[PDB]
């Protein structure tokens, strides 16, 4: 079957460079233009650039955001197309997909839909390294209490890499708990929150502790979440 | 996106017909550039769905149809099936960008449970974080269906876009969805305003919660 396989992902510092090879199989690589597309974590698709067949000079065309920084090239004898990324910026962080441009003929011209996609490879541009989280309480108050139910939680900030797990009262409190996925800040560090809803009457009588584990930094944090009388 | 505009979400029950619009410009669809559609199933790479405005690749069933008229394109799904839950992206060439442009993407939900409006809780910076010279507002959204919201922030009634981070919705234990959004501020920014608000839009309706820096400090 037709197949594309990217390699070469990884973590690289801003201002450095990385090459991604993409190997094609199951079709005649040289018969097709090839196109790169990227998808930053949580975001939509964004075209990177494409390269024509060698018989036409293998000319290339890029999105404005990577012009003068990224270079696409191809080697038809090895069925490989390369994405050379120079001058990397944090906002280049994305999954990079290698794609094949179709040959289907329309009314007087060829279409250019991307009809085969690789699985994609992650490129992270960041100066972050292993870092344990800071844990802050999200104290319950009148502003988080509705109809006799109070929400409280804990904010787990600026850690690397994923993941952290959160439990409440050592696993004894599970009803109403939700731990959210993390957000990636531009600094390259992650943050998340965990929330639980409890009866507002229990607040003076029950203790609530969120247990944060970040195994990459060998850190555990048990944060007491005290209610605010406002 | 800028030059191609899609609705962030669309939904319907199994068997229904839904449409996804792709509103273009005279620098792309209106100038005659063809429209392409890509389907991205959750956790997968995109696949070509429609090429050259209305053509289906082999392997794409005929409940998918594409049309174009003027500066607009549209993807119809006639007879929604469960496996069609996916993000859909339209794509066209744009001469003001001189590149291949994508719409922002539409999440299609195939409804399997009753719709449910979101609950919203907004947390101010904790004193502990403030004492560490940082400030994060935390807006938590829960118990909603389908799993698509938009979150906007305000300071003193005025929009604020810098410093915002939002997660894509994910399932809670009760099978509804939750989402979170964060506003990062300096302690001085926080203290300098009278109010901060998060506004959560779900199915064209909006829930807004407000905190005041002068309270709970
Ligand atoms: Na070509």
Coordinates of C-alpha atoms in Angstrom, one line a residue, chain A residues 51-187:
Chain A
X51 CA 8.4 20.6 -3.6
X52 CA 7.8 19.9 -7.3
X53 CA 9.0 17.0 -9.4
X54 CA 12.7 17.0 -10.3
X55 CA 11.9 17.1 -13.9
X56 CA 10.7 20.6 -13.3
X57 CA 13.7 21.5 -11.2
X58 CA 12.3 20.4 -7.9
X59 CA 11.4 24.0 -7.1
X60 CA 9.9 24.8 -3.7
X61 CA 7.3 27.1 -2.2
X62 CA 6.8 28.0 1.5
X63 CA 4.4 29.5 3.9
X64 CA 5.5 33.1 4.8
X65 CA 6.2 32.0 8.4
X66 CA 9.1 29.7 7.3
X67 CA 10.5 31.5 4.2
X68 CA 14.2 31.9 4.6
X69 CA 14.3 29.4 7.4
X70 CA 13.0 26.0 6.2
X71 CA 14.2 24.1 3.1
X72 CA 12.6 21.2 1.4
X73 CA 14.6 18.8 -0.9
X74 CA 14.1 15.4 -2.4
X75 CA 16.3 12.5 -3.4
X76 CA 14.4 10.5 -6.0
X77 CA 16.8 7.6 -6.0
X78 CA 16.2 6.9 -2.3
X79 CA 12.4 7.9 -2.3
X80 CA 13.0 10.4 0.5
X81 CA 11.8 14.0 0.9
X82 CA 13.5 16.1 3.5
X83 CA 12.3 19.0 5.6
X84 CA 15.4 21.0 6.8
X85 CA 14.5 23.4 9.6
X86 CA 17.0 26.1 10.4
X87 CA 16.6 29.1 12.8
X88 CA 14.0 27.3 14.9
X89 CA 11.5 29.3 17.0
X90 CA 9.4 28.1 19.8
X91 CA 6.3 28.6 17.7
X92 CA 7.6 26.0 15.2
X93 CA 6.7 23.4 17.9
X94 CA 4.3 21.0 16.1
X95 CA 3.6 17.6 14.7
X96 CA 5.1 17.6 11.2
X97 CA 3.2 15.6 8.5
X98 CA 4.8 14.5 5.2
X99 CA 2.2 14.3 2.4
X100 CA 1.9 13.3 -1.2
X101 CA 0.3 15.7 -3.8
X102 CA -2.2 13.9 -6.0
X103 CA -2.0 13.5 -9.7
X104 CA -5.8 13.4 -10.5
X105 CA -6.6 15.5 -13.6
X106 CA -9.5 18.0 -13.4
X107 CA -11.0 20.2 -16.2
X108 CA -7.8 21.2 -18.0
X109 CA -5.4 21.0 -15.1
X110 CA -4.2 18.8 -12.3
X111 CA -5.6 19.1 -8.8
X112 CA -3.2 19.3 -5.8
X113 CA -5.0 17.6 -3.0
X114 CA -2.7 15.9 -0.4
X115 CA -3.9 12.3 -0.9
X116 CA -1.4 10.3 1.3
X117 CA -0.4 11.5 4.8
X118 CA 2.4 10.2 7.0
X119 CA 1.7 9.6 10.7
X120 CA 3.5 12.8 11.7
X121 CA 6.5 13.4 13.9
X122 CA 6.7 15.7 16.9
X123 CA 9.3 18.6 16.9
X124 CA 9.5 20.5 20.2
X125 CA 11.4 23.8 20.2
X126 CA 12.1 24.7 23.8
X127 CA 14.7 25.5 26.3
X128 CA 12.8 23.6 29.0
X129 CA 14.3 20.7 30.9
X130 CA 13.1 18.5 33.7
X131 CA 11.4 20.7 36.3
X132 CA 9.0 19.8 39.1
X133 CA 5.7 21.7 39.6
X134 CA 4.6 24.4 41.9
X135 CA 1.2 23.6 43.4
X136 CA -1.2 26.3 44.5
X137 CA -4.7 25.9 46.1
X138 CA -7.9 26.9 44.3
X139 CA -9.7 27.7 47.6
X140 CA -13.4 27.3 47.8
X141 CA -15.3 30.5 48.6
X142 CA -18.8 32.0 48.1
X143 CA -17.7 32.7 44.5
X144 CA -17.2 28.9 43.8
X145 CA -20.3 27.7 45.8
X146 CA -23.7 27.3 44.2
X147 CA -26.8 25.7 45.6
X148 CA -24.9 24.2 48.5
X149 CA -22.1 22.6 46.4
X150 CA -18.6 24.1 46.6
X151 CA -15.9 23.6 44.0
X152 CA -12.2 23.6 45.1
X153 CA -9.1 22.4 43.4
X154 CA -5.3 22.8 42.9
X155 CA -3.3 24.5 40.2
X156 CA -0.2 22.6 39.2
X157 CA 2.1 25.0 37.5
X158 CA 5.3 25.0 35.3
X159 CA 6.5 21.5 35.1
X160 CA 8.3 19.5 32.5
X161 CA 7.9 17.0 31.0
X162 CA 4.4 15.5 31.0
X163 CA 2.7 13.9 32.9
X164 CA 1.5 14.6 36.4
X165 CA -1.2 12.7 38.1
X166 CA -3.5 14.1 40.8
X167 CA -5.6 12.4 43.4
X168 CA -7.5 13.8 46.4
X169 CA -7.1 12.7 50.1
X170 CA -4.8 9.9 49.0
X171 CA -7.3 8.3 46.7
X172 CA -10.1 8.3 49.3
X173 CA -12.0 11.1 47.5
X174 CA -13.0 10.3 43.9
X175 CA -16.6 11.4 43.5
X176 CA -16.8 14.6 41.5
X177 CA -13.0 14.8 40.8
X178 CA -11.9 15.9 37.5
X179 CA -8.2 16.4 36.5
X180 CA -7.9 18.5 33.3
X181 CA -5.4 18.0 30.5
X182 CA -2.3 20.2 30.6
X183 CA -1.7 23.4 28.7
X184 CA 1.7 24.1 27.1
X185 CA 2.9 27.6 27.7
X186 CA 5.3 29.3 25.3
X187 CA 8.1 28.8 27.8

